[PDB]
Amino acid sequence: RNEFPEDPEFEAVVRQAELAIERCIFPERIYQGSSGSYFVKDPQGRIIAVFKPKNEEPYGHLNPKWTKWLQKGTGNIFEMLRIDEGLRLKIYKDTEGYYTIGIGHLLTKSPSLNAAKSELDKAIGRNTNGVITKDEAEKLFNQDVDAAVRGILRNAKLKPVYDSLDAVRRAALINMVFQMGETGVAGFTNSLRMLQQKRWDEAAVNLAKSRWYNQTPNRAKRVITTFRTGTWDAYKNLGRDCLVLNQGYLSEAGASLVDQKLELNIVPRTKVVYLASETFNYSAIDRVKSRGRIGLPPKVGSFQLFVEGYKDADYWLRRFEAEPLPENTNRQLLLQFERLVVLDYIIRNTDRGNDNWLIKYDDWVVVKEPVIKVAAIDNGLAFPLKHPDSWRAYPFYWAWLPQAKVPFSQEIKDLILPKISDPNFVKDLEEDLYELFKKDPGFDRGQFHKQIAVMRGQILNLTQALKDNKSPLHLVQMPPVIVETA
Ligand SMILES: Nc1ncnc2c1ncn2[C@@H]1O[C@H](COP(=O)(O)OP(=O)(O)O)[C@@H](O)[C@H]1O
Ligand SMILES: Nc1ncnc2c1ncn2[C@H]1C[C@]2(CO)CC[C@H]1C2
């Protein structure tokens, strides 16, 4: 299902990719990144493209790094709880004020610290003085996990649900019985009903209203969604929470869509593309049904054209500092840089570093070629649901570069103000992004609107920075805003 009549060059590169696969010259897995990235090659073995399947994304289901994790099944209860309970080597108080130690191990509900210390020496087998070791905390931990499992299986109300749950939800029920114990979780009898009948969004609500959750909502909500989605997603990124969970390929393409409309031309053309390759990471089911013929299903991903002759922004800027560019070349760098800032600001890039963009440094009817040129790669971490909570965690790295000190050139204002000042352009931009993002099965209209709000707020700021001839740096000091509808 791959066709792009609007862009026949792109389609042609895609056609070489498929053909090369038919010929068993497979996209090869990039070592140089975290690993759901491939070098697409053509039938002659040259590298024509970079491909990032959605399901191999960092939060991705078929991500190679996290598959080992998915193998464990219920056996993830240990890490799950390590994450919720942390580790402490000295007596502390829990949320309710009860004496605790190691990984969530409750000593007593008594107010006396020596009751607790007493209860602790009994457990460990020595005089602890309220302080235990890593191994001691781990041994308490297993026993406490065993005890939880026993609590569930010794019980008539819990066991039925537990046996009917998939490996991941089972881990969630153990989590609760770790925290509240056998008798406590069995007082949820309603929610156990839903869990038993498999209705997840029903139950995901009732656990939302309890004395529990009320006490430990951050954790409770983490379990509730492990119940709702049958997955580990609440346990892999607490938190980014600035970004939609697994839509990087759409970020990637979207970044390229924006570049196209603003006519920046720093983003190598990127689109949503389907490919099947033996080199990808597929479920075992899929591997088997291929007959080893049916063949592998195509995966949906971002397909980004490959550009040659470029090096790390980092690589070049380091050299230009020791041996500075002549004014005329250096002005070409700056003009390229402005385009980058405009891109990143508009799409609100969250992870542009000096490794994430590339530089290439080399009367009449035709324009002399530029010596210097900028490619913006690795755009899948943009389009956030909202501004980051601590600007220090997700900054704009290029802001600390000296080039960020230079006032926006009239050239960028000329390129950019007529577009982003035209409400029909920004409208059109939102329709194009919409037609792009909605194609995702996990698309959510409410999430989209939030994304757009940020984008509209970024545009609002950019417009005035440009009118006032601010530097890129003064632009980022402008307080972040969102433009919200309803
Ligand atoms: N890379 C960056 N990304 C976002 N903002 C930046 C960046 N570099 C500098 N700034 C801006 O510089 C300003 C100086 O820090 P400031 O926020 O005043 O300190 P504080 O956080 O204590 O108020 C900030 O408002 C911030 O917006
Ligand atoms: N479109 C691209 N063209 C050329 N090189 C790229 C591209 N995207 C990424 N890279 C390099 C940066 C890497 C990190 O993502 C490390 C080597 C490749 C991939």
Coordinates of C-alpha atoms and ligand atoms in Angstrom, one line a residue:
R1 CA 0.0 0.0 0.0
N2 CA 2.8 2.5 -0.7
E3 CA 2.1 5.3 -3.1
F4 CA 3.0 9.0 -3.2
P5 CA 1.8 10.7 -6.5
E6 CA 2.6 14.1 -4.9
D7 CA 6.2 13.0 -4.7
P8 CA 7.3 10.6 -7.5
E9 CA 11.0 10.8 -6.5
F10 CA 10.2 9.6 -3.0
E11 CA 8.1 6.9 -4.4
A12 CA 10.9 5.8 -6.7
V13 CA 13.3 5.5 -3.7
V14 CA 10.7 3.5 -1.9
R15 CA 10.4 1.2 -5.0
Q16 CA 14.1 0.4 -4.9
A17 CA 13.7 -0.4 -1.2
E18 CA 11.0 -3.0 -1.9
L19 CA 12.9 -4.4 -4.9
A20 CA 16.0 -4.8 -2.9
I21 CA 14.1 -6.7 -0.2
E22 CA 12.6 -9.0 -2.9
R23 CA 16.2 -9.6 -3.9
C24 CA 17.0 -10.3 -0.3
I25 CA 19.2 -7.3 0.3
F26 CA 17.7 -6.3 3.6
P27 CA 17.6 -3.1 5.5
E28 CA 20.3 -3.5 8.1
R29 CA 19.9 -2.7 11.7
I30 CA 21.7 0.4 12.8
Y31 CA 24.2 -0.2 15.7
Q32 CA 24.8 3.5 16.2
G33 CA 21.4 4.2 17.7
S34 CA 19.0 2.6 20.2
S35 CA 17.9 -0.2 18.0
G36 CA 14.6 0.1 16.1
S37 CA 16.4 1.9 13.2
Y38 CA 17.5 0.4 9.9
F39 CA 19.6 1.3 6.9
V40 CA 17.5 0.6 3.8
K41 CA 19.6 -0.3 0.9
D42 CA 18.8 -0.6 -2.8
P43 CA 19.4 -3.6 -5.0
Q44 CA 23.0 -2.4 -5.5
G45 CA 23.6 -2.4 -1.8
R46 CA 23.8 1.4 -1.3
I47 CA 22.1 3.1 1.6
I48 CA 19.1 5.0 0.3
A49 CA 17.1 5.5 3.5
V50 CA 16.6 5.3 7.2
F51 CA 13.6 3.4 8.5
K52 CA 12.0 3.4 12.0
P53 CA 9.2 1.0 12.4
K54 CA 6.5 2.1 14.9
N55 CA 6.4 -1.2 16.7
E56 CA 10.2 -1.2 17.2
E57 CA 10.0 2.3 18.9
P58 CA 11.6 2.8 22.4
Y59 CA 8.1 2.4 23.9
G60 CA 7.4 0.0 21.1
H61 CA 5.8 -3.5 21.5
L62 CA 8.3 -5.3 19.2
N63 CA 11.2 -3.2 20.4
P64 CA 14.2 -5.5 20.6
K65 CA 15.5 -4.0 23.8
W66 CA 12.3 -4.6 25.7
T67 CA 11.3 -8.0 24.3
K68 CA 13.4 -9.9 26.9
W69 CA 11.3 -8.1 29.4
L70 CA 8.1 -9.3 27.8
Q71 CA 9.3 -12.8 28.0
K72 CA 9.3 -12.8 31.8
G73 CA 5.5 -12.6 31.9
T74 CA 4.3 -12.5 35.5
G75 CA 8.0 -12.8 36.5
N76 CA 8.1 -9.0 36.0
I77 CA 6.3 -8.7 39.3
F78 CA 9.8 -8.2 40.9
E79 CA 10.9 -5.2 38.8
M80 CA 7.4 -3.9 38.8
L81 CA 7.4 -3.8 42.6
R82 CA 11.1 -2.6 42.8
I83 CA 9.9 0.4 40.8
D84 CA 6.8 1.1 43.0
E85 CA 8.5 0.4 46.3
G86 CA 12.1 1.5 45.7
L87 CA 14.8 0.3 48.1
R88 CA 15.6 1.4 51.6
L89 CA 18.2 0.0 54.0
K90 CA 16.9 1.7 57.1
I91 CA 13.5 1.8 58.9
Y92 CA 11.3 4.5 57.4
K93 CA 7.5 5.3 57.5
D94 CA 5.2 4.5 54.6
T95 CA 2.4 6.7 53.2
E96 CA 0.2 5.9 56.1
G97 CA 2.9 6.4 58.7
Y98 CA 3.7 2.7 59.3
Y99 CA 7.2 1.5 60.0
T100 CA 8.7 0.0 56.8
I101 CA 12.0 -1.3 55.4
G102 CA 13.8 -2.6 52.3
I103 CA 11.3 -2.9 49.4
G104 CA 7.9 -2.2 50.7
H105 CA 8.3 -4.5 53.7
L106 CA 5.8 -3.5 56.4
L107 CA 7.2 -4.2 59.9
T108 CA 4.3 -3.2 62.1
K109 CA 1.3 -0.9 62.3
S110 CA 2.5 0.0 65.8
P111 CA 3.8 3.6 66.6
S112 CA 6.8 2.4 68.5
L113 CA 10.1 2.4 66.7
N114 CA 11.4 -0.4 68.9
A115 CA 8.3 -2.5 68.1
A116 CA 9.4 -2.1 64.6
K117 CA 13.1 -2.7 65.3
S118 CA 12.1 -5.7 67.3
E119 CA 9.9 -7.0 64.5
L120 CA 12.9 -6.4 62.2
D121 CA 15.5 -8.4 64.2
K122 CA 13.1 -11.3 64.3
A123 CA 12.8 -11.2 60.5
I124 CA 16.5 -10.9 59.6
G125 CA 17.9 -13.1 62.4
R126 CA 20.2 -10.6 64.1
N127 CA 20.4 -7.2 65.8
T128 CA 19.8 -4.9 62.9
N129 CA 19.7 -1.6 64.7
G130 CA 17.0 -0.6 62.2
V131 CA 19.5 -1.0 59.4
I132 CA 19.7 -3.9 56.9
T133 CA 21.6 -4.9 53.7
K134 CA 20.9 -5.3 50.0
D135 CA 20.8 -9.0 50.2
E136 CA 18.7 -8.9 53.4
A137 CA 16.2 -6.6 51.7
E138 CA 16.0 -8.9 48.7
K139 CA 15.4 -12.0 50.8
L140 CA 12.5 -10.2 52.6
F141 CA 11.3 -9.2 49.2
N142 CA 10.9 -12.7 47.7
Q143 CA 9.2 -13.9 50.8
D144 CA 6.9 -11.0 50.6
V145 CA 6.2 -11.9 46.9
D146 CA 5.6 -15.5 47.7
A147 CA 3.3 -14.5 50.5
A148 CA 1.3 -12.3 48.0
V149 CA 1.0 -15.1 45.5
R150 CA -0.1 -17.4 48.4
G151 CA -2.6 -14.8 49.5
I152 CA -4.2 -14.9 46.0
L153 CA -4.3 -18.7 45.5
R154 CA -5.4 -19.5 49.1
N155 CA -8.3 -17.3 48.4
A156 CA -11.7 -18.2 46.9
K157 CA -12.6 -14.7 45.7
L158 CA -9.2 -13.8 44.3
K159 CA -8.0 -17.0 42.7
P160 CA -10.8 -17.2 40.1
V161 CA -10.0 -13.8 38.8
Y162 CA -6.3 -14.5 38.9
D163 CA -6.5 -17.7 36.9
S164 CA -8.6 -15.9 34.2
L165 CA -6.1 -13.1 33.9
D166 CA -3.3 -12.9 31.3
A167 CA 0.3 -13.0 32.6
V168 CA 0.5 -9.2 32.8
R169 CA -2.8 -8.5 34.6
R170 CA -1.9 -11.3 37.1
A171 CA 1.2 -9.3 37.9
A172 CA -1.1 -6.3 38.6
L173 CA -3.2 -8.3 41.0
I174 CA -0.1 -9.5 42.8
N175 CA 1.0 -5.9 43.0
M176 CA -2.1 -5.0 44.9
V177 CA -2.0 -7.9 47.3
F178 CA 1.6 -6.9 47.9
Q179 CA 0.5 -3.5 49.0
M180 CA -2.9 -4.3 50.7
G181 CA -2.6 -8.0 51.4
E182 CA -5.0 -10.9 50.7
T183 CA -8.0 -9.8 52.7
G184 CA -7.8 -6.2 51.5
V185 CA -7.9 -6.8 47.8
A186 CA -10.8 -9.2 48.2
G187 CA -12.9 -6.3 49.4
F188 CA -12.9 -4.9 45.8
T189 CA -15.3 -7.6 44.8
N190 CA -17.0 -5.4 42.2
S191 CA -13.8 -4.7 40.3
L192 CA -12.8 -8.4 40.5
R193 CA -16.1 -9.0 38.7
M194 CA -15.1 -6.8 35.8
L195 CA -11.6 -8.2 35.7
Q196 CA -13.1 -11.7 35.5
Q197 CA -15.5 -10.8 32.7
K198 CA -12.6 -9.1 30.9
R199 CA -14.1 -5.7 30.8
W200 CA -11.1 -3.5 31.4
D201 CA -12.4 0.0 31.0
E202 CA -15.2 -0.8 33.4
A203 CA -12.9 -1.9 36.1
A204 CA -10.1 0.6 35.3
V205 CA -12.7 3.1 36.7
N206 CA -13.6 1.3 40.0
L207 CA -10.1 1.0 41.1
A208 CA -9.9 4.7 40.3
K209 CA -12.4 5.2 43.2
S210 CA -11.1 3.6 46.4
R211 CA -9.5 4.5 49.6
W212 CA -6.5 3.0 47.8
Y213 CA -5.4 5.2 44.9
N214 CA -6.6 8.0 47.1
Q215 CA -3.6 7.3 49.3
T216 CA -1.1 6.3 46.6
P217 CA -2.6 7.6 43.3
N218 CA 0.7 7.8 41.4
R219 CA 1.2 4.1 42.0
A220 CA -2.4 3.1 41.9
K221 CA -2.8 4.8 38.5
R222 CA 0.3 2.9 37.4
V223 CA -1.4 -0.4 38.2
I224 CA -4.8 0.5 37.0
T225 CA -3.4 1.1 33.5
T226 CA -1.4 -2.2 33.7
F227 CA -4.8 -3.7 34.3
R228 CA -6.6 -1.7 31.5
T229 CA -4.0 -2.1 28.7
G230 CA -2.6 -5.5 29.6
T231 CA 0.8 -4.0 29.0
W232 CA 3.9 -2.7 30.9
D233 CA 3.7 0.8 29.3
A234 CA 3.2 2.6 32.7
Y235 CA 6.5 1.0 33.9
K236 CA 8.9 2.0 31.1
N237 CA 8.8 5.9 31.1
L238 CA 7.8 7.5 34.4
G239 CA 7.9 10.0 33.2
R240 CA 8.4 11.6 29.8
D241 CA 4.8 12.4 29.8
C242 CA 5.4 15.4 27.7
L243 CA 4.9 13.1 24.6
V244 CA 2.4 10.8 23.2
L245 CA 3.5 7.3 24.0
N246 CA 4.4 5.6 20.7
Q247 CA 4.0 7.9 17.7
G248 CA 7.6 8.8 16.9
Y249 CA 7.3 7.7 13.2
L250 CA 4.5 10.3 12.9
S251 CA 6.7 12.9 14.6
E252 CA 9.4 12.0 12.0
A253 CA 7.1 12.4 9.1
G254 CA 5.3 15.4 10.6
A255 CA 8.6 17.1 11.1
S256 CA 9.2 16.7 7.3
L257 CA 5.7 17.8 6.5
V258 CA 6.3 21.1 8.3
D259 CA 9.7 21.6 6.7
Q260 CA 8.0 21.2 3.3
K261 CA 5.2 23.8 4.0
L262 CA 7.5 26.4 5.5
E263 CA 9.8 25.7 2.6
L264 CA 12.8 25.2 4.9
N265 CA 14.3 22.2 3.2
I266 CA 16.5 21.1 6.0
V267 CA 14.6 17.9 6.7
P268 CA 15.3 15.0 4.3
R269 CA 12.0 13.9 2.9
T270 CA 10.2 11.6 5.4
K271 CA 7.0 9.8 5.0
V272 CA 4.9 7.1 6.6
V273 CA 5.9 3.9 4.7
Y274 CA 5.1 0.2 5.0
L275 CA 7.9 -2.5 4.6
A276 CA 8.4 -6.2 5.2
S277 CA 11.9 -7.4 5.9
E278 CA 13.3 -10.6 7.2
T279 CA 15.8 -8.5 9.2
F280 CA 13.0 -6.8 11.3
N281 CA 11.9 -8.1 14.6
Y282 CA 8.6 -9.9 14.3
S283 CA 6.4 -11.8 16.8
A284 CA 7.0 -15.5 16.7
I285 CA 3.5 -16.0 15.5
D286 CA 4.2 -13.9 12.5
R287 CA 7.5 -15.7 11.9
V288 CA 5.7 -19.0 11.8
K289 CA 2.8 -17.9 9.6
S290 CA 5.2 -16.7 7.0
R291 CA 5.8 -20.4 6.3
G292 CA 9.5 -19.7 6.9
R293 CA 4.7 -18.7 0.9
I294 CA 2.6 -16.3 3.0
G295 CA 5.5 -14.0 4.0
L296 CA 6.1 -11.5 6.9
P297 CA 3.5 -8.7 7.3
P298 CA 4.6 -5.2 6.3
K299 CA 5.4 -2.9 9.3
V300 CA 4.4 0.7 9.4
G301 CA 7.2 3.2 9.9
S302 CA 9.0 6.4 9.1
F303 CA 11.0 6.3 5.9
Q304 CA 13.6 9.1 5.7
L305 CA 15.8 9.6 2.6
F306 CA 19.5 9.3 3.2
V307 CA 21.8 12.2 2.6
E308 CA 25.4 11.9 1.9
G309 CA 28.4 14.1 2.6
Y310 CA 27.3 15.3 6.0
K311 CA 28.9 15.2 9.4
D312 CA 27.7 15.9 13.0
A313 CA 26.8 19.5 13.6
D314 CA 29.2 18.8 16.5
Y315 CA 31.9 17.6 14.2
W316 CA 31.9 20.8 12.1
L317 CA 31.3 23.5 14.8
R318 CA 34.3 22.2 16.7
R319 CA 36.5 22.8 13.6
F320 CA 35.0 26.2 12.7
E321 CA 36.1 27.3 16.1
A322 CA 39.8 26.5 15.6
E323 CA 39.8 27.5 12.0
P324 CA 36.9 30.1 11.7
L325 CA 34.8 30.2 8.4
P326 CA 35.2 33.3 6.2
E327 CA 32.3 35.8 6.8
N328 CA 30.5 34.8 3.6
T329 CA 30.4 31.0 4.3
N330 CA 29.7 31.6 8.0
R331 CA 26.6 33.6 7.0
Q332 CA 25.4 30.6 5.1
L333 CA 25.7 28.5 8.3
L334 CA 23.7 31.1 10.2
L335 CA 20.9 31.2 7.6
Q336 CA 20.7 27.4 7.8
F337 CA 20.7 27.6 11.6
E338 CA 17.7 29.9 11.6
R339 CA 15.7 27.4 9.6
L340 CA 16.6 24.7 12.2
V341 CA 15.5 27.0 15.1
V342 CA 12.2 27.7 13.3
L343 CA 11.7 23.9 12.7
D344 CA 12.5 22.9 16.3
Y345 CA 10.5 25.7 17.8
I346 CA 7.4 25.1 15.7
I347 CA 7.3 21.3 16.3
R348 CA 8.6 21.9 19.8
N349 CA 11.4 19.4 19.4
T350 CA 12.3 17.8 22.7
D351 CA 15.6 16.1 21.8
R352 CA 17.7 18.2 19.4
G353 CA 21.3 17.9 20.3
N354 CA 24.5 18.5 18.2
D355 CA 24.3 14.9 17.1
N356 CA 20.7 15.3 15.9
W357 CA 21.6 17.7 13.1
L358 CA 24.2 17.4 10.3
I359 CA 26.3 19.9 8.4
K360 CA 27.8 19.5 5.0
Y361 CA 30.7 21.7 4.1
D362 CA 32.1 21.9 0.6
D363 CA 25.0 37.5 -14.8
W364 CA 23.4 34.1 -15.1
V365 CA 20.0 32.2 -14.9
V366 CA 21.1 30.0 -11.9
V367 CA 22.0 30.6 -8.2
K368 CA 25.5 29.7 -7.1
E369 CA 25.5 26.5 -4.9
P370 CA 25.9 27.0 -1.1
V371 CA 29.2 25.9 0.5
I372 CA 27.5 24.9 3.7
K373 CA 24.2 23.1 4.3
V374 CA 22.2 21.7 7.3
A375 CA 20.2 18.5 7.6
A376 CA 17.8 18.0 10.5
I377 CA 17.5 14.2 11.2
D378 CA 16.0 12.1 14.1
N379 CA 12.8 14.1 14.5
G380 CA 10.6 11.5 16.3
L381 CA 10.7 13.1 19.8
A382 CA 8.6 16.2 18.8
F383 CA 5.0 17.3 18.8
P384 CA 4.5 17.2 22.6
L385 CA 1.1 17.1 24.4
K386 CA 2.3 20.1 26.5
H387 CA 5.3 22.1 27.5
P388 CA 7.9 20.2 29.7
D389 CA 7.5 20.7 33.4
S390 CA 11.2 21.7 34.0
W391 CA 12.6 23.5 30.9
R392 CA 16.0 22.2 32.1
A393 CA 15.0 18.5 31.5
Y394 CA 13.9 19.1 27.8
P395 CA 15.7 22.3 26.7
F396 CA 16.6 23.5 23.2
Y397 CA 20.2 22.6 23.2
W398 CA 21.1 24.9 20.3
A399 CA 20.1 27.9 22.6
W400 CA 23.5 27.7 24.3
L401 CA 25.4 27.9 21.0
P402 CA 26.9 31.3 20.1
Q403 CA 24.9 31.3 16.9
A404 CA 21.8 31.5 18.9
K405 CA 22.9 34.9 20.0
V406 CA 22.5 36.4 16.4
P407 CA 19.2 38.3 15.6
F408 CA 16.9 36.7 13.2
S409 CA 17.9 37.8 9.7
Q410 CA 15.4 39.6 7.5
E411 CA 15.7 36.6 5.2
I412 CA 14.0 34.3 7.7
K413 CA 11.4 36.8 8.5
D414 CA 10.7 37.1 4.8
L415 CA 10.5 33.4 4.3
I416 CA 8.5 32.7 7.4
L417 CA 6.3 35.6 8.6
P418 CA 4.0 35.6 5.5
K419 CA 3.1 31.9 6.1
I420 CA 2.7 31.8 9.9
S421 CA 0.9 35.1 10.0
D422 CA -1.7 33.7 7.6
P423 CA -4.3 32.0 9.7
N424 CA -5.3 30.0 6.7
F425 CA -1.8 28.6 6.4
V426 CA -1.7 27.6 10.1
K427 CA -5.2 26.1 9.6
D428 CA -4.0 24.2 6.5
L429 CA -1.0 23.1 8.5
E430 CA -3.2 21.6 11.2
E431 CA -5.4 19.8 8.6
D432 CA -2.3 18.2 7.0
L433 CA -1.0 17.1 10.4
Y434 CA -4.4 15.8 11.2
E435 CA -4.6 13.8 8.0
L436 CA -1.2 12.4 9.0
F437 CA -1.7 11.7 12.7
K438 CA -5.3 10.2 12.5
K439 CA -4.0 7.3 10.5
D440 CA -2.6 5.8 13.6
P441 CA -4.8 3.1 15.2
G442 CA -4.1 4.6 18.7
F443 CA -4.9 8.1 17.5
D444 CA -6.9 10.2 20.0
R445 CA -8.7 13.4 19.0
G446 CA -8.2 15.0 22.4
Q447 CA -4.5 14.3 22.4
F448 CA -4.3 15.9 18.9
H449 CA -5.9 19.1 20.0
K450 CA -3.4 19.4 22.8
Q451 CA -0.5 18.9 20.4
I452 CA -1.9 21.6 18.1
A453 CA -2.4 24.0 21.1
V454 CA 1.3 23.8 21.9
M455 CA 2.1 24.3 18.2
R456 CA -0.2 27.3 18.0
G457 CA 1.4 28.7 21.1
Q458 CA 4.9 28.2 19.7
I459 CA 3.8 29.9 16.4
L460 CA 2.3 32.8 18.5
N461 CA 5.7 33.3 20.1
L462 CA 7.7 32.8 16.9
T463 CA 5.6 35.4 15.0
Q464 CA 6.5 38.1 17.5
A465 CA 10.1 37.2 17.9
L466 CA 10.4 37.5 14.2
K467 CA 8.6 40.8 14.1
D468 CA 10.8 42.2 16.8
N469 CA 14.0 40.8 15.3
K470 CA 14.9 38.8 18.4
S471 CA 17.7 36.2 18.5
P472 CA 16.9 32.5 18.6
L473 CA 18.1 32.7 22.2
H474 CA 15.6 35.5 23.2
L475 CA 13.0 33.5 21.5
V476 CA 13.4 30.6 23.9
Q477 CA 13.3 32.9 26.9
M478 CA 9.8 33.9 25.9
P479 CA 7.5 32.2 28.4
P480 CA 5.9 29.1 26.7
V481 CA 2.2 29.4 26.0
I482 CA -0.6 27.3 24.5
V483 CA -3.5 28.5 22.4
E484 CA -6.5 26.4 23.6
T485 CA -9.9 26.0 21.9
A486 CA -13.4 25.3 23.5
Ligands
LIG1 N1 17.8 25.8 26.0 C1 16.8 26.5 26.6 N2 15.5 26.1 26.5 C2 14.6 26.8 27.1 N3 14.8 28.0 27.7 C3 16.1 28.5 27.8 C4 17.2 27.7 27.3 N4 18.3 28.4 27.5 C5 18.0 29.5 28.2 N5 16.6 29.5 28.4 C6 15.9 30.6 29.1 O1 16.8 31.4 29.9 C7 16.1 31.9 31.1 C8 17.0 32.0 32.3 O2 16.7 31.1 33.3 P1 15.3 31.4 34.2 O3 14.2 30.5 33.8 O4 15.2 32.9 34.4 O5 15.7 30.7 35.6 P2 14.5 30.2 36.6 O6 14.2 28.9 36.0 O7 15.2 30.2 37.9 O8 13.5 31.3 36.4 C9 14.9 30.9 31.3 O9 13.7 31.6 31.4 C10 14.8 30.1 30.0 O10 13.5 30.2 29.5
LIG2 N1 18.7 10.9 6.9 C1 20.1 10.6 7.3 N2 21.1 10.7 6.4 C2 22.3 10.5 6.8 N3 22.7 10.1 8.0 C3 21.7 9.9 8.9 C4 20.4 10.1 8.6 N4 19.7 9.9 9.7 C5 20.5 9.5 10.7 N5 21.8 9.5 10.2 C6 23.0 9.1 11.0 C7 22.8 9.6 12.5 C8 22.5 8.3 13.2 C9 21.7 8.4 14.5 O1 20.3 8.3 14.3 C10 23.9 7.6 13.4 C11 24.3 7.3 12.0 C12 23.0 7.6 11.2 C13 21.9 7.4 12.2

